[PDB]
Amino acid sequence: ASEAEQRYEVQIVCRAEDEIQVRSLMLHSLGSSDLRLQSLHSEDLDNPAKLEVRAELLGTPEAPAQLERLVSRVSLEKGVSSVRWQVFELAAD
């Protein structure tokens, strides 16, 4: 309808123990993805052992299923404490 590509910020809270696996599966789920990665801010949040990786992925509101896909593929892996995605939209002007 209207070209409004939104940024979905996938915030994966994962143990540092398996962060590399988590991030590898993140990239794996980027294997032909509508969701186009911009950046992934990986900081320590809950605890130094739990790294929260908040990645900006651009996608349209027409692609919610892809977010599920990402979340599922990463949730298949161990180390993930919590995984949320924030729909950040464009500023309605």
C-alpha positions as MATLAB code, in Angstrom:
seq = 'ASEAEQRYEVQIVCRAEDEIQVRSLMLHSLGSSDLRLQSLHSEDLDNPAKLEVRAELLGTPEAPAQLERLVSRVSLEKGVSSVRWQVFELAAD';
ca = [
       0.000    0.000    0.000;
       2.438    2.597    1.219;
       6.155    2.193    1.259;
       6.949    2.462    4.870;
       9.770    0.205    5.751;
       9.993   -0.159    9.462;
      12.845   -1.105   11.664;
      12.372   -4.059   13.789;
      14.751   -4.309   16.546;
      15.324   -7.824   17.533;
      16.642   -7.881   21.035;
      18.072  -11.203   21.829;
      19.139  -11.711   25.372;
      21.564  -14.542   25.235;
      24.193  -16.010   27.463;
      27.766  -15.110   26.466;
      28.410  -18.803   26.624;
      26.517  -19.402   23.369;
      26.378  -15.886   21.910;
      28.426  -16.964   18.913;
      25.940  -19.751   18.111;
      23.064  -17.302   18.561;
      24.644  -14.731   16.250;
      25.523  -17.447   13.741;
      21.873  -18.483   13.627;
      20.878  -14.813   13.346;
      23.024  -14.645   10.244;
      21.651  -18.037    9.149;
      18.115  -16.641    9.323;
      19.411  -13.761    7.166;
      19.856  -16.409    4.519;
      17.514  -14.803    2.062;
      15.575  -12.572    4.354;
      13.126   -9.732    3.713;
      14.467   -8.369    6.935;
      17.540   -6.447    6.048;
      20.032   -5.992    8.858;
      21.486   -2.604    9.598;
      23.283   -2.849   12.913;
      23.370   -5.038   15.990;
      24.189   -3.432   19.245;
      25.532   -6.052   21.476;
      25.862   -4.943   25.050;
      25.703   -6.505   28.471;
      22.366   -5.948   30.141;
      20.893   -8.317   32.740;
      24.177   -9.687   33.815;
      27.689   -9.632   32.229;
      27.007  -13.250   31.205;
      23.805  -12.293   29.427;
      24.466  -10.258   26.365;
      21.615   -8.418   24.808;
      21.983   -8.140   21.149;
      19.646   -5.603   19.701;
      19.681   -5.743   15.946;
      18.028   -3.289   13.599;
      16.386   -5.106   10.755;
      14.474   -3.216    8.131;
      11.329   -4.776    6.912;
       7.859   -3.904    5.961;
       4.734   -4.369    8.183;
       3.749   -6.906    5.521;
       6.464   -9.322    6.713;
       5.610  -10.241   10.471;
       6.053  -13.936    9.623;
       9.727  -13.284    8.933;
      10.197  -11.995   12.472;
       8.707  -15.250   13.753;
      11.129  -17.089   11.495;
      14.126  -15.245   12.962;
      12.909  -15.706   16.518;
      12.190  -19.386   15.925;
      15.557  -20.175   14.342;
      17.422  -18.458   17.137;
      15.101  -19.912   19.831;
      16.063  -23.375   18.535;
      19.510  -22.667   19.971;
      20.635  -22.788   23.538;
      21.819  -19.764   25.418;
      18.899  -17.559   24.604;
      17.428  -16.253   27.791;
      14.774  -14.081   26.190;
      14.011  -12.819   22.702;
      11.834   -9.843   21.972;
      11.399   -7.693   18.934;
      10.422   -4.102   18.946;
       8.573   -2.606   16.050;
      10.064    0.788   15.523;
       8.200    2.700   13.002;
       8.801    5.768   10.934;
       7.772    9.060   12.407;
       4.291    9.919   11.284;
       4.675   13.349    9.835;
];
